[PDB]
Amino acid sequence: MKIAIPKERRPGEDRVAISPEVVKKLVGLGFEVIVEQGAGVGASITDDALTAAGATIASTAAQALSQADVVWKVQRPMTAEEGTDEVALIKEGAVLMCHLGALTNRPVVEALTKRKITAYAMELMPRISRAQSMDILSSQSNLAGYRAVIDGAYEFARAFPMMMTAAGTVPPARVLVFGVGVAGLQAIATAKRLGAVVMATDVRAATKEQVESLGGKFITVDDEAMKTAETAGGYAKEMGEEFRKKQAEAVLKELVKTDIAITTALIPGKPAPVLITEEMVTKMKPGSVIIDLAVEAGGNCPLSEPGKIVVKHGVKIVGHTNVPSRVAADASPLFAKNLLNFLTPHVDKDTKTLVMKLEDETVSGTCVTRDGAIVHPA
Amino acid sequence: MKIAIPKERRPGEDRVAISPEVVKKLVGLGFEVIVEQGAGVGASITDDALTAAGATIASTAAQALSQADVVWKVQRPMTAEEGTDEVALIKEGAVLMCHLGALTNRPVVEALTKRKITAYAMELMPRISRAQSMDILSSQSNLAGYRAVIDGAYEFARAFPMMMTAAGTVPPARVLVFGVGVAGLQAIATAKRLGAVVMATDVRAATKEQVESLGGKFITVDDEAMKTAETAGGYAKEMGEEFRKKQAEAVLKELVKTDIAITTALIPGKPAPVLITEEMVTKMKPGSVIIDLAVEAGGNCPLSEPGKIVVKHGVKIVGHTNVPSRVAADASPLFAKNLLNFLTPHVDKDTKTLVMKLEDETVSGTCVTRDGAIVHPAL
Amino acid sequence: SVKAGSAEDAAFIMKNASKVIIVPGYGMAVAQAQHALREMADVLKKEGVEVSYAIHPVAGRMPGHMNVLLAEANVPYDEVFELEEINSSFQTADVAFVIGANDVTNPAAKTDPSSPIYGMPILDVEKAGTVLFIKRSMASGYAGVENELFFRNNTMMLFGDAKKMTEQIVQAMN
Ligand SMILES: NC(=O)C1=CN([C@@H]2O[C@H](COP(=O)(O)OP(=O)(O)OC[C@H]3O[C@@H](n4cnc5c(N)ncnc54)[C@H](OP(=O)(O)O)[C@@H]3O)[C@@H](O)[C@H]2O)C=CC1
Ligand SMILES: NC(=O)c1ccc[n+]([C@@H]2O[C@H](COP(=O)([O-])OP(=O)(O)OC[C@H]3O[C@@H](n4cnc5c(N)ncnc54)[C@H](O)[C@@H]3O)[C@@H](O)[C@H]2O)c1
Numbered sequence: 069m070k071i072a073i074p075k076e077r078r079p080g081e082d083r084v085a086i087s088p089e090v091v092k093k094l095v096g097l098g099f100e101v102i103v104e105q106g107a108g109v110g111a112s113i114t115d116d117a118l119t120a121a122g123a124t125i126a127s128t129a130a131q132a133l134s135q136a137d138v139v140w141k142v143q144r145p146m147t148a149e150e151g152t153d154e155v156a157l158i159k160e161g162a163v164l165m166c167h168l169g170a171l172t173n174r175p176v177v178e179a180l181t182k183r184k185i186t187a188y189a190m191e192l193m194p195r196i197s198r199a200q201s202m203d204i205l206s207s208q209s210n211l212a213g214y215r216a217v218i219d220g221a222y223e224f225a226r227a228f229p230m231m232m233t234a235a236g237t238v239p240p241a242r243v244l245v246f247g248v249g250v251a252g253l254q255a256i257a258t259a260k261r262l263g264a265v266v267m268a269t270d271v272r273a274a275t276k277e278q279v280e281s282l283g284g285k286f287i288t289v290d291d292e293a294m295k296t297a298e299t300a301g302g303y304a305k306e307m308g309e310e311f312r313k314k315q316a317e318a319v320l321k322e323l324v325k326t327d328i329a330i331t332t333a334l335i336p337g338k339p340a341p342v343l344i345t346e347e348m349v350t351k352m353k354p355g356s357v358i359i360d361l362a363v364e365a366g367g368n369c370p371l372s373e374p375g376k377i378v379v380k381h382g383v384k385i386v387g388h389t390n391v392p393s394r395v396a397a398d399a400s401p402l403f404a405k406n407l408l409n410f411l412t413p414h415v416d417k418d419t420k421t422l423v424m425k426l427e428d429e430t431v432s433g434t435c436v437t438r439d440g441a442i443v444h445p446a
Numbered sequence: 447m448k449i450a451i452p453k454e455r456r457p458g459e460d461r462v463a464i465s466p467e468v469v470k471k472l473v474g475l476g477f478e479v480i481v482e483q484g485a486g487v488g489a490s491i492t493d494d495a496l497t498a499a500g501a502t503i504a505s506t507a508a509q510a511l512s513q514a515d516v517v518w519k520v521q522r523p524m525t526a527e528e529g530t531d532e533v534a535l536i537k538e539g540a541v542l543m544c545h546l547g548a549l550t551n552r553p554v555v556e557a558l559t560k561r562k563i564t565a566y567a568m569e570l571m572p573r574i575s576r577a578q579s580m581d582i583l584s585s586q587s588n589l590a591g592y593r594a595v596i597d598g599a600y601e602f603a604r605a606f607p608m609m610m611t612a613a614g615t616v617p618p619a620r621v622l623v624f625g626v627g628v629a630g631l632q633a634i635a636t637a638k639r640l641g642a643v644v645m646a647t648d649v650r651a652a653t654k655e656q657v658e659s660l661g662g663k664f665i666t667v668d669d670e671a672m673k674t675a676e677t678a679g680g681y682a683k684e685m686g687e688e689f690r691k692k693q694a695e696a697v698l699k700e701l702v703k704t705d706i707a708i709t710t711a712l713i714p715g716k717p718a719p720v721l722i723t724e725e726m727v728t729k730m731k732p733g734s735v736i737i738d739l740a741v742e743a744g745g746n747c748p749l750s751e752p753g754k755i756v757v758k759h760g761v762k763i764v765g766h767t768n769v770p771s772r773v774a775a776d777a778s779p780l781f782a783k784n785l786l787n788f789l790t791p792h793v794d795k796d797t798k799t800l801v802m803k804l805e806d807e808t809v810s811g812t813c814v815t816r817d818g819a820i821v822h823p824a825l
Numbered sequence: 826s827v828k829a830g831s832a833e834d835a836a837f838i839m840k841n842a843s844k845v846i847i848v849p850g851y852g853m854a855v856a857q858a859q860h861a862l863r864e865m866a867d868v869l870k871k872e873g874v875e876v877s878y879a880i881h882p883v884a885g886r887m888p889g890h891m892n893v894l895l896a897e898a899n900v901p902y903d904e905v906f907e908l909e910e911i912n913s914s915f916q917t918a919d920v921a922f923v924i925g926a927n928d929v930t931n932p933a934a935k936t937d938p939s940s941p942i943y944g945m946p947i948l949d950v951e952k953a954g955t956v957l958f959i960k961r962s963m964a965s966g967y968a969g970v971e972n973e974l975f976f977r978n979n980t981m982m983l984f985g986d987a988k989k990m991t992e993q994i995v996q997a998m999n
């Protein structure tokens with residue numbers, strides 16, 4: 069059996085769906101691991117080290133994928149229209165696991181369907197406790213939360229920590245993080261590390277204890293209606309205009325004192341909720357930064373533009389795309405192990421085969437297509 | 447008695463020699479604080495905020511300095527030889543106070559002398575506890591050391607802290623700080639609070655303790671040689687090439703595992719000592735960075751280039767210029783507080799003039815020219 | 826001519842105190858005694874005693890040396906105070922717990938024109954009822970000058986390491 073990993077061809081994607089450690093275990097399951105030449109240069113993962121882990125190396129993408137029974141990518145394959153038909157390079161009938169973005173990319177799904185390819189979209193991993201070690205949303209949003217604070221600090225003309233000095237007290241920065249998810253919690257931790265004062269807010273009332281354990285102060289808005297705001301999986305729902313104005317008002321007291329504002333809020337299905345409007349940035353101090361991690365999903369701030377730092381009203385509004393890739397050398401070995409944990413339970417004890425348990429809800433909620441038949445209820 | 451503060455004309459210089467707090471204290475001491483418009487826009491100190499504190503916002507650089515008994519700026523004035531005669535705009539017989547870099551820049555001192563201006567080179571501030579409040583080297587170096595860590599974290603493709611997750615563990619970054627002065631000590635602090643393992647090294651004996659006091663480990667080289675490595679005001683000496691060899695070999699064990707190397711080493715008057723050679727960056731693993739705070743005076747690593755992020759042998763050698771300006775909004779109110787603490791004791795109380803005491807150790811050692819004659823011994 | 830003392834000695838004094846102000850310095854950083862210090866802090870706060878920190882501009886060996894280490898030990902910003910904003914409180918303070926600080930407290934800055942430390946504004950630890958002084962020996966600070974405070978009735982020298990002495994003081998308390 070043969071598993072294969074190409075270099076990511078999409079612009080600015082320095083991640084790779086493999087690591088030396090993860091290759092070791094793949095060989096122990098009975099796979100031949102082939103990796104494209106220079107596939108992990110952006111993640112500081114060398115060709116030598118992959119081969120040292122027990123992996124062949126292909127010169128080209130097509131050469132790595134030619135007789136590959138299973139294929140691991142990070143980002144979704146490019147279609148013929150997009151520039152380079154990577155879907156064609158995959159061997160007909162092989163299984164394909166990656167961040168497919170399937171619910172918004174129907175063209176790439178049915179192209180794989182034309183070649184009997186069984187594609188597993190990892191971003192659809194259900195929110196059950198046992199599949200956290202397989203979750204790519206989670207492992208990558210963690211690093212995205214850290215990176216946001218590093219980006220704020222880079223774009224900020226002041227220093228984070230309080231320092232009493234002979235020239236005078238330099239005050240601590242005031243971070244305020246909207247949305248205390250995986251990314252929000254890491255942002256609080258990282259900003260607190262650098263000596264900031266960190267406020268934060270969320271619709272989910274369970275999140276209150278989490279912020280205060282990291283050393284932050286919580287912003288209460290609707291103590292009653294926040295208990296009726298959490299779903300089965302743990303993600304947020306829509307709150308409407310009533311709550312949006314009680315929040316925008318309650319948070320304004322701190323936002324005019326805020327230096328760095330990190331916004332992470334997401335609502336599955338719907339666009340990202342507006343937490344900071346243009347009217348709100350006018351009240352903010354000049355020299356302030358806003359990091360909008362939800363920018364690729366509309367944004368929590370409408371002023372932010374994907375891939376651009378936007379200066380309006382004396383406030384830099386950062387909207388970097390693919391934030392996790394800005395930490396590729398950490399994001400990659402974590403992405404590789406997400407896939408190793410998804411695949412491991414369905415590999416036979418001694419048989420050299422991949423029997424993907426269709427009963428397993430890890431497999432049911434993930435499988436987009438199989439053998440030329442789109443099984444996902446989309 | 448007029449004191450004017452212009453905009454910094456030099457490229458890549460967002461700082462200003464004033465803040466609202468200092469304007470309040472100045473006018474209260476009996477000054478009329480003028481300041482060119484847009485002076486502190488790069489430091490987030492708006493024109494309105496300055497007039498609120500009690501300042502006149504002049505239109506141009508000429509108008510502000512024309513009738514000013516004192517001038518404060520951050521970097522030295524430009525001369526006619528550099529295309530812009532900033533020194534011409536300063537009133538005859540006035541008092542300039544800035545970072546002149548007078549020892550390396552003789553031309554600007556002669557131009558200030560032809561106008562009979564009394565210039566105070568604020569970088570020649572003697573190293574004493576009495577005058578640490580007046581010291582621009584420290585306040586700006588400190589922020590530059592913080593910056594180096596912020597910049598290293600930016601260009602680096604892993605996260606500083608160790609992280610234990612459901613998907614697995616990622617190790618912390620490993621920082622190596624060469625040169626443990628004011629800058630390097632705040633770099634050891636900023637890296638260590640971000641969760642990195644922080645090694646460091648120096649040539650002065652009393653440094654080993656200082657590195658450990660922040661929570662980093664020290665790399666010794668010749669504990670019988672670091673004994674006589676300090677000088678008058680705590681500065682370091684030159685060490686020849688028999689120490690340059692002995693440092694690189696012991697360092698090499700740790701440099702091979704280093705992700706981010708911050709180099710702050712710098713000798714006063716002379717250029718920077720080479721602590722990381724090209725041969726050493728070959729042995730550094732791909733994905734590494736070197737932040738070189740000494741780039742503007744030789745560089746601790748020859749590969750680094752002013753204002754550029756060069757990439758050789760897999761290593762992002764970063765080498766920004768004017769690093770305290772990369773923190774301009776905190777760096778400026780400090781710089782202004784330094785200028786203020788130096789000037790405050792010399793304001794004649796009941797008359798609203800100023801007289802600089804000659805026997806004052808802080809004035810004697812910082813004065814470069816006075817009443818149209820070069821004063822400093824070393825010029 | 827110096828009144829020495831043990832950890833149990835200093836335990837009795839701060840337990841029976843209405844207000845303590847901790848004055849950390851370079852010695853506190855060397856010993857890495859900041860986690861132990863904030864422990865001594867919130868055993869005193871638990872029994873009701875008013876605790877604050879007085880940070881001199883040039884404590885330690887760098888700008889903000891004290892701040893980053895206190896920040897590591899989770900001492901909240903509201904308890905930490907700068908020189909100009911806290912020097913009056915020493916009058917209304919039973920104890921100035923000076924842990925690893927010397928030059929910062931030295932009154933020779935205003936009683937010795939010849940001294941090099943002269944001119945620099947200092948923390949008035951002498952204005953407090955009594956003063957604890959944790960340092961390994963009788964050695965001078967950075968500036969290399971004898972402290973007038975070292976020997977006089979309102980002062981007590983706890984000789985030793987700042988981490989071990991402060992850990993021994995927490996044990997003497999409950
Ligand atoms: N902050 C800055 O930017 C800089 C400051 N400075 C100078 O530092 C001085 C600041 O003084 P300050 O911070 O109050 O302290 P000092 O430097 O005056 O000395 C602190 C005292 O604590 C001691 N000590 C050392 N190790 C330990 C230990 N493990 N346990 C207990 N005590 C220890 C020493 O005494 P013993 O050895 O007897 O225990 C020493 O006398 C000023 O003169 C300032 O100008 C200098 C350069 C930079
Ligand atoms: N396998 C698993 O069990 C698993 C995987 C990921 C997350 N989770 C859990 O799910 C929860 C959410 O984490 P996430 O990273 O998936 O969240 P997410 O990426 O879906 O959204 C980020 C955060 O934005 C918040 N938010 C949305 N709309 C908002 C508004 N109008 N105002 C304020 N905040 C708003 C949400 O509450 C959420 O915490 C966490 O508790 C996490 O532990 C579990």
Ligand SMILES: NC(=O)c1ccc[n+]([C@@H]2O[C@H](COP(=O)([O-])OP(=O)(O)OC[C@H]3O[C@@H](n4cnc5c(N)ncnc54)[C@H](O)[C@@H]3O)[C@@H](O)[C@H]2O)c1
Nearest residue numbers: 573574575578625626627628648649680681682711712719
């Ligand atoms: N009296 C005071 O209150 C006071 C306040 C601040 C600073 N200072 C003193 O000023 C002095 C200088 O500080 P700075 O930040 O300007 O230092 P600096 O800018 O001169 O250089 C930074 C560091 O580079 C190191 N270095 C030089 N050549 C080297 C080599 N070949 N290899 C390795 N390291 C090398 C030096 O030891 C120094 O610590 C310090 O000793 C400090 O104690 C005194």
